[PDB]
Amino acid sequence: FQSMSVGFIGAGQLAFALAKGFTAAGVLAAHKIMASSPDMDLATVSALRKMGVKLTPHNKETVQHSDVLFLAVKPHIIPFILDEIGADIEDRHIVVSCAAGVTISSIEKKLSAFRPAPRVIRCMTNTPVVVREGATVYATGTHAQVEDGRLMEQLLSSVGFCTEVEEDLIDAVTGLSGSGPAYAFTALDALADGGVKMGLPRRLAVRLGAQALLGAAKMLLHSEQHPGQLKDNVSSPGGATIHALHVLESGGFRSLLINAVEASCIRTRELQSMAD
Amino acid sequence: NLYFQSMSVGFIGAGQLAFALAKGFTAAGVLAAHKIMASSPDMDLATVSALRKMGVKLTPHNKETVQHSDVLFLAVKPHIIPFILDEIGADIEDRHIVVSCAAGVTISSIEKKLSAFRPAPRVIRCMTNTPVVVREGATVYATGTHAQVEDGRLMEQLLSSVGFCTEVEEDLIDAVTGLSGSGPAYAFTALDALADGGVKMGLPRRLAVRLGAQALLGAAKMLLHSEQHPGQLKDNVSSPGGATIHALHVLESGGFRSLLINAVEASCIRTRELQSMAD
Amino acid sequence: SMSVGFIGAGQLAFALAKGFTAAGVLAAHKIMASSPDMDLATVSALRKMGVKLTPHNKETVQHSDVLFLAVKPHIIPFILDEIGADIEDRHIVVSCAAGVTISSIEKKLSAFRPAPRVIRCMTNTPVVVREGATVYATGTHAQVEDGRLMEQLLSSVGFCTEVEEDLIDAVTGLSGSGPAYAFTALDALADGGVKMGLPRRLAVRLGAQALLGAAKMLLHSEQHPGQLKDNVSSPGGATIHALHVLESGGFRSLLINAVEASCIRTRELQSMAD
Amino acid sequence: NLYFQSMSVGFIGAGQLAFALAKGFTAAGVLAAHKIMASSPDMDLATVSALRKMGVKLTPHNKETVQHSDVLFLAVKPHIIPFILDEIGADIEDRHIVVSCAAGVTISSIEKKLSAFRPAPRVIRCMTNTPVVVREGATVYATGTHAQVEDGRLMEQLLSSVGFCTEVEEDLIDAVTGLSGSGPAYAFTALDALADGGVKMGLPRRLAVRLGAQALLGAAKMLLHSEQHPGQLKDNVSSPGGATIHALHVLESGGFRSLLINAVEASCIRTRELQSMAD
Ligand SMILES: O=C(O)C1CCCC1
Ligand SMILES: O=C(O)C1CCCC1
């Protein structure tokens, strides 16, 4: 539905990523998106502007334009935003919070002081929506209609994986797929360094490592097999791969990724307990 | 709209790599499965049973593969290659392009073996990986002494149908083995561990596996489609004070980057050993 | 015709006065600095510089329009008690002390005269060679010309930009303490040069030149520091081998640890003040 | 500045170093971009597009660069140097000053190759770094057997226009490689990490990169302009009980200093290996 009007409160990386993805998917026209920022001097705002997205310094204007309204500002700004534009949330609005940690309860508490049944959806998505390969989960609020969940899923499915979850899973999702791309970019940078150390040109090492990661991830998604089984299938006895896997194990490679997911999840919980 | 009507492909070996390439080529539409033949000394393999269902011609005799094939993939373990080349060396004809996929095995050693039977064998050395099974492989190749200009181009067209493919100098292939050859196993290990992390924080295992794999897929795709440095893309994910930068700190504190450097180095060095102790 | 004063005549006051006068934005004789111990080395160097000196904080307040507070943070309250009754309409109070909040300064000064004009800044010692890194936050009653004047004064001795006050403790961890990280790194790099056979004097020069040149490349490039690192390291080469050993020691994480530890200690100290 | 009046400069190799030096030299006003020639086997590189846009003459034939040049910089990987010396060695004339920038490659090895062509090749070995592109390089050079006295003076004046430059005995050069040759990469790693630290504590990435870069620049300039020991300047920054000494403790607990010593040693040792891998 290109007839949908979409707003973003916040014109940062995620607003840009989602707007880019939605327009590339054909589901929205760029000029049917409006975004607001208190800082119009950002680079993301210039890219949004170049895309044809409407830009304004007035959050109220984004709200009035919008049918689906994404909250795409830092968690600690969300209560101030709700104070500011709570009076302007209408019954027709679906309010979609993308802020890490921020609970449906806290949003509904603010918005309920104005109209009684604000339709609220909480989502955790990630920057690969920009190439329509995002990972998105969402939870529906108290007054979100069944059609609202399905509309949400349809829209976010256009830019990658999307599924409904209970809200108590979202902080963990944040630690896994929300922060996940950054772990991968770190990994890809390091793998390229290892390629370069062993004699590959940087450009080729970056390409090969990224292609290797894309292909393996795709294999797993399209396989009913355990990742341990796919790992077994790669490594011939006495061979190069199993030697590399040993040195990963000796440094506690697996545990570092578990540490990461946990640290991001826990911090996400602190961002909310800091608020409440 | 690529298709090789004249080309008969054979695999010496019917294991994981031969399966992956034949599945990729057939899914790409570039080869009919019935125009592919694979040989193996063990017809009781699951990969062998899977190639059957695809329609691949199977035989226990490597000489049959060679007689049926124009493009000949050596998909056996490196230490088996010399015995293979001794076995079928007298069956190599002018028409054959021998594509070795064995890790570490040099063009020099293959040409020396085959040249004892017939001069000017056309040899191509290849490092590819298992994601060719989903047409997202990463493949490099190096052309031998007697490989014609059309030979490498033909191999690039074919291997491009199942993922990234480019020509390299042969002395890069051991390093590519360490990076993209072994790379999928690094990723499978990472995805298992990330799923463990998701489970620890309360996600169901199936969802954690799906989300972690989607995250890696999307990130890798972002980088392939971006002109930006992976550090710059990393910067765009992490909000100041946020969850991501906290998690990045704990990766750094464990030397995460150095473990991946360590791995590429270890695989490449083992690959060089596999050769150096062959010859 | 601007009069600048310094409460405290230690390392930071000398650094700023030296930078300001080397910059040509202030005459040394228009600068006054007060100290409870006129026998510090920093006092002699300010004297030799042409700065006016005194042991009366009240004389400095009376002398100047722009008043820098360059004492240790636990002294700021006792300085504000001592001179709060002498702050005039004309005064801009610029606190350089780590952690001390605009709120707490305005509260002490407001007991004597309403609407004190207060600026909080975080700078560092390289202002002495006019390559400092300075941020500042404007107080409740700072006029708009106060901040712009502040940025003009401090841009003459390095980078200067306005920040929200809640960023300043982090800046302290990064560019406030940063020169000490860099001096530690330079000492160690020189040790590495000496171990590999270089004379100490040459190793210190080359290591310092390397860090300066790389810093300037980054400041002047639109590119990411990762991308500039890629450009240094040829495949299989010496640099990528050295980067591996830094990575195996968690080099990056130690620098993150440092910025965090300094920021957290800055927050800790202010909460002890509260 | 009579050295540079009508002096022509050539680059064998058009990679990062050739661009940085060419950009540095032009920005200093010592050479017009049109008086600089560069050769590269692959003109498909980015630096070759950047250089071409500078008004710099490119060519794929190193013999063209040799013919067009007085001072000839060898800016190719160390394993290529003896291959280049064989290619253009008969074209090296008495007028040429051959300035090798390849890490590890010894004056002796270059002179031995070129001495078979003409008896007294003028050879200078150089270790510089990428900040010559903003005229803040760190350069050392050693003069060869047949370099005339003006050659070393000419070399010093040229490289002084893009940063620090001093003559050294050649046996120090591998160590300088480990320190200031590789050093900017250490700084870029450090700056990326400091910026991550700033982001973790709530700073926007852009501001954190700028603040971290300015802190390093200011501290380096401070040390260069001070007669004081680095530890004394460190002491001046740290207030008792304060934030800086707390941060320095955590650096010390991770062996921060030993990592930098490790780095200089590792690069120096790798440089020595790249020399001995040649001869
Ligand atoms: O706080 C953060 O870093 C966002 C939540 C997951 C992705 C970014
Ligand atoms: O081998 C290398 O990496 C070159 C020598 C110093 C910087 C690059």
DSSP assignments along B9-50, one per residue: EEEE--SHHHHHHHHHHHHTTSS-GGGEEEE-S-TT-HHHHH
B255·C256 Cβ contact <8 A: no
Closest-approach residue (CA) in chain B for C248: B258
Identify the CA nearest to A177 among candidates A260, A105, A244. Answer: A260
Contact C256 B262 (CB under 8 A): no
Q: Give the residue on B whose Cα is nearest the Cα of A263.
A: B247
| Contact criterion met (CB < 8 Å) for A177 and B211 | yes
Buried b (16+ CB within 10 A) or exposed e, A131-152: bbbbbbbbbbbebbeeebbebb
Sign of the CA dihedral running A19, A22, A25, A27: negative
Give the other-Cβ count within 10 Å of D162's Cβ. Answer: 26
Q: Of the candidates B9, B7, B67, B77, which has an alpha carbon nearest to the alpha carbon of residue B42?
A: B77
Chains touching A (at least 3 CB pairs under 8 A) are B, C
D158: which 2 tokens?
Answer: 């040229």
Check: CB of residue B36 under 8 Å from CB of residue B23: no
Cα dist from B118 to B72, B90, B114, B136, D66, whole Å: 16, 7, 7, 36, 44
Give the DSSP per-residue string, D161-199. TTEEEEE--GGGHHHHIIIIISHHHHHHHHHHHHHHHHH
Q: Which residues on adjacent β-strands are paired with residue B9?
A: B36, B71
Interface residue C262 vs chain D (CB under 8 A): yes
Contacts of B3 (CB under 8 A, 6+ apart): B29, B30, B31
Q: What is the CATH number of domain C172-274?
A: 1.10.3730.10
Q: D28: part of which helix (H) or strand (E)?
A: helix D16-28
Exposure letters A190-210 (e unless 16+ CB within 10 A, then b): bbbbbbbbbbbbbebbbbbbb
C-alpha distances in angstroms, D264 versus B100, C207, D185? 41, 10, 11
Q: Whose CA is nearest to atom 6 of ligand 2?
A: D181
Taking the Cβ of residue A84 and every Cβ of chain C, the question of whether any pair is shorter than 8 Å is answered with no
* Residue C243: closest C-alpha in chain A: A193
One-letter amino acid of B64 = E
Q: Where are chain A's structural domains?
A: 1-173, 174-276
Count the neighbouring beta carbons within 10 Å of the beta carbon of residue B254.
Answer: 19
For residues A160 and A134, is the Cβ–Cβ distance under 8 A? yes
CB-based contact, C36 to chain B, within 8 Å? no
Q: With contact defined as beta carbons under 8 Å apart, do D182 and D263 qualify?
A: yes
List all residues 6 or more positions away from D87 whose beta carbon is below 8 Å from its beta carbon.
Answer: D62, D63
Measuring CA to CA, which residue among B87, B121, B83, B115 is closest to residue B102?
B83
Name the C residues in 175-204 with CB < 8 Å from any B CB: none
Residue length of chain A: 276
User: Within a 13 Å sphere around the CA of A128, how many CA atoms are in the beta-carbon half?
Assistant: 31
> What is the separation of C-alpha D271 from the centre of its chain, rounded to a whole number of angstroms?
14
- Chains with 3 or more CB pairs under 8 A to chain C: A, B, D
Is C250 an 8 Å CB contact of chain B? yes
Do residue D193 and residue B248 have CB atoms under 8 angstroms apart? no
Of C224, C215, C148, C159, the closest CA to residue C185 belongs to C215
Interstrand relation of A33-36 and A94-97 (parallel, antiparallel or unpaired):
unpaired
Question: Using the 8-state DSSP alphabet, how is residue A1 labeled?
Answer: -
Backbone angles phi, psi at C39, to 5 degrees: -110, 15
* CA of A123 relative to ligand 1 center, distance in Å: 12
What are the residue ranges of helices labelled H in C3-142?
11-23, 41-49, 57-63, 76-83, 102-110
10 Å CB burial of residue D172 (0-12, 13-18, 19+) is buried
How many angstroms from the chain centroid is the CA of residue C87? 24
Contacts 24+ apart (CB under 8 A), D244-249: D244/C176, D244/C177, D244/C180, D244/C262, D246/C261, D246/C262, D246/C264, D246/C265, D247/C173, D247/C177, D247/C180, D247/C181, D247/C257, D247/C258, D247/C259, D247/C261, D247/C262, D247/C265, D248/C177, D248/C180, D248/C181, D248/C184, D248/C258, D249/C261
Backbone phi and psi for residue D250, each to the nearest 5 degrees, phi listed first: -70, -30
For residues A15 and A8, give the distance between their C-alpha atoms in angstroms, rounded to a whole number. Answer: 6
Whether residue C236 and residue A193 make contact (CB cut-off 8 A), yes or no, is no
How many whole angstroms separate alpha carbon A156 and alpha carbon B43?
A: 47
B77 labelled as ligand-binding?
yes
Other beta carbons within 10 angstroms of residue B41's beta carbon come to 12
CB C239 within 8 A of CB D266: no
Please state, in angstroms and rounded to a whole number, the distance separating the CA atoms of residues A152 and A131: 19
Query: What is the spatial distance between Cα A236 and Cα B13, in angstroms, rounded to a whole number?
Result: 14
CATH of domain A1-173: 3.40.50.720
Alpha carbons C236 and D251: distance in angstroms, whole number: 29
CA of C237, closest atom in ligand 2: 1
SS3 category, A177? helix
Name which CATH class applies to C1-171.
Answer: alpha beta
Contact partners, residue A183, CB within 8 Å, separation at least 6: A257, A260, B194, B215, B247, B248, B251
Subunit contact B247:A258, Cβ cutoff 8 A: no
- Asked if residue D101 lies in contact with residue D179, where contact means CB atoms within 8 angstroms, the answer is no
C31 DSSP β-pair partners:
C4
Residues of chain C contacting residue D130, judged by C-beta atoms under 8 Å apart: 213-214, 217, 228, 231-232
B160 close to ligand 1 (CB < 6 Angstrom): no
Q: Is D236 part of any known ligand binding site?
A: yes
The separation between CA D153 and the C-alpha centre of its own chain, rounded to angstroms, equals 18
> Crossing angle of helices A104-112/A78-85, nearest 10°?
30
DSSP A10: S
Length in residues, chain D: 279
- Count other Cβ atoms within 10 Å, centred on residue B26: 20
Centroid of ligand 2 to alpha carbon of C239 (angstroms): 5
- Rounded distance between C-alpha atoms, residue B193 and residue B199, angstroms: 10
Partner residue facing A220 (CB), from B176, B213, B223: B213
Q: Quick check: helix, strand or coil at residue C31? A: strand
Given a contact cutoff of 8 angstroms between Cβ atoms, the answer to whether C233 and D215 are in contact is no
The size of chain C, in residues, is 274
Q: Which two tokens stand for residue B196?
A: 């463990």
Are β-strands A160-164 and A134-140 bridged in parallel, bridged antiparallel, or unpaired? parallel
Q: Is A62 in the pocket of ligand 1 (CB under 6 A)?
A: no
For a mutational test of ligand 1's pocket, the pick from A122, A137, A264, i.e. the residue with the most ligand atoms closer than 8 A to its C-beta, is A264
Q: What are phi and psi of B164, to 5 degrees?
A: -70, 140
Q: Do C252 and B252 touch (CB under 8 A)?
A: yes
C-alpha span between C70 and C120 (Å, rounded): 11
Give yes or no for C253 touching D (CB within 8 A): yes
> Residue type for B109, please?
S
Contact indicator for B237, A169 with CB cutoff of 8 Å: no
Of the partner residues B220, B223, B256, the one whose CB lies closest to the CB of residue A190: B256
Among B258, B264, B268, B272, most C C-beta atoms within 10 A, so best to mutate, is B258
Encoded tokens for C42: 């920093």
Cα–Cα distance between C248 and B261 in angstroms, integer? 9
CB C52 within 8 A of CB C25: no
Tell me which H or E stretch contains A225.
none
D21-44 burial string, b = 16+ CB within 10 Å, else e? bbbbbbebebbeeebbbbbbeeee
Give the residue from chain A lying closest to C230, CA to CA: A202
The DSSP call for residue D226 is -
Selected for mutation to probe chain C from D23, D259, D271, D274 (highest C CB count within 10 Å) is D259
A103 within ligand 1 shell (Cβ under 6 A):
no
Q: Which residues contact B46 (CB under 8 A, 6 or more apart)?
A: none
Q: What share of chain D is helix, strand, coil (3-state, %, to 5)?
A: 60, 15, 30
Residue A276, judged by CB atoms within 10 A of its CB (0-12, 13-18, 19+), counts as exposed
What is the whole-number distance in angstroms between the Cα of residue D267 and the centre of ligand 2?
A: 8
Q: Do the Cβ atoms of A229 and B197 come closer than 8 Å?
A: no
Separation CA D22–CA D15 (nearest Å)? 11
Per residue in B151-180, is it b (16+ CB within 10 Å) or e — as a string?
bbebbbebbbbbbbbeebeeebbbbbbbbb
- Is B14 marked as binding a ligand? yes
Between CA B187 and CA B213 the distance in angstroms is: 9
For the record, the structure tokens of A182 come out as 């950054």
3-state SS, C141-203, equals CCCHHHHHHHHHHHHCCEEEEECCHHHHHHHHHHHHCHHHHHHHHHHHHHHHHHHCCCCHHHH
Stated as kind and residue range, the H or E segment containing B270 is: helix B256-276
CATH fold of A174-276, please? ProC C-terminal domain-like fold (1.10.3730)
Which of C196, C232, C243, when mutated, tests ligand 2's pocket best, judged by the most ligand atoms within 8 Å of its CB? C232
- Distance CA(A204)–CA(A202), nearest Å, equals 5
Give yes or no for a contact between B212 and B195, defined as CB atoms under 8 angstroms apart.
Answer: yes
Instruction: Let me know: does A184 contact A209? Beta carbons within 8 Å.
Output: no
Q: Name the nearest CA neighbour of C180 among B166, A275, A271, D236.
A: D236
CB contact under 8 A, A189 and C226: yes
By CB neighbour count within 10 A (0-12 exposed, 13-18 middle, 19+ buried), where does D70 fall? middle
Crossing angle of the two packed helices D256-276 and C178-195, in degrees rounded to 10: 40
CA distance B228 to chain D (A): 15
Residue D220 touches chain C, beta carbons under 8 Å: yes
Gaps in chain B (C to N distance exceeding 2.5 A) after = none
Instruction: Choose among C175, B2, A256, C89: nearest CA to D243.
Output: C175
The C-alpha angle C136, C140, C146, rounded to 5 degrees, equals 55
Neighbours of B82 (CB within 10 A): 16
For residue A34, the number of C-alpha atoms closer than 13 Å in the C-beta half-sphere is 18
Nearest to B199 by CA among B189, B188, B212: B212
Q: In whole angstroms, give the CA distance from residue A178 to residue B246.
A: 13
Residue D128 Cβ < 6 Å to ligand 2? no
The CATH superfamily of D177-279 is ProC C-terminal domain-like (1.10.3730.10)
**Residue C254's closest chain B neighbor by CA?**
B253
Enter the CATH code of domain B1-176: 3.40.50.720
Distance CA D64, CA D76 (A): 16
Say whether B120 sits in a helix, a strand or coil: coil
∠ CA(C63), CA(C67), CA(C68), 5° rounding? Answer: 135
Q: Three-state SS string across A28-75, please?
A: CCHHHEEEECCCCCCHHHHHHHHHCCEEECCHHHHHHHCCEEEECCCH
Q: Are A258 and B251 in contact (CB under 8 A)?
A: no
Are D133 and D159 spatial neighbours (Cβ–Cβ below 8 Å)?
A: no
Contact B241, D201 (CB under 8 A): yes
3-state secondary structure of D74: strand
Paired with A9 in beta bridges are A36, A71
Tell me the C-alpha distance between A261 and C91, whole Å: 51
Inter-axis angle of helices B230-237 and C225-232, to 10 degrees? 160
Provide the resolution (angstroms): 1.9
CA angle at residue C190 from C185 to C191, to 5 degrees? 100
Region of residue C197 (left: phi > 0; alpha: psi -120 to 50; beta: else): left
Ligand 2 neighbourhood includes C241 CB (under 6 angstroms): no
> According to the annotation, is B208 in a ligand binding site?
no
Residue D29, marked binder: no
| Alpha-carbon gap: C82 to the closest alpha carbon of chain D (Å) | 23
> Cα-flanking dihedrals φ and ψ of residue D58, to 5°?
-110, 160
Q: Are C72 and C41 in contact (CB under 8 A)?
A: no
Instruction: List the one residue out of C229, C180, C174 whose CA is nearest residue D257.
Output: C180
Which technique was the structure solved with, according to the deposited record?
X-ray
C254 marked as part of a ligand binding site: no
| Nearest chain B CA: its distance from D66 CA (Å) | 27
Is B108 marked within a binding site?
no
Neighbouring residues of D201: CB distance < 8 A, sequence distance ≥ 6: B240, B241, C169, C170, C173, C174, C259, C260, C263
Flag if A196 and C226 touch (Cβ within 8 Å). no
Nearest to B261 among C223, C247, C249 (CB): C247
Identity of the amino acid at D60: P
For ligand 1, atom 1, the nearest C-alpha belongs to: B242
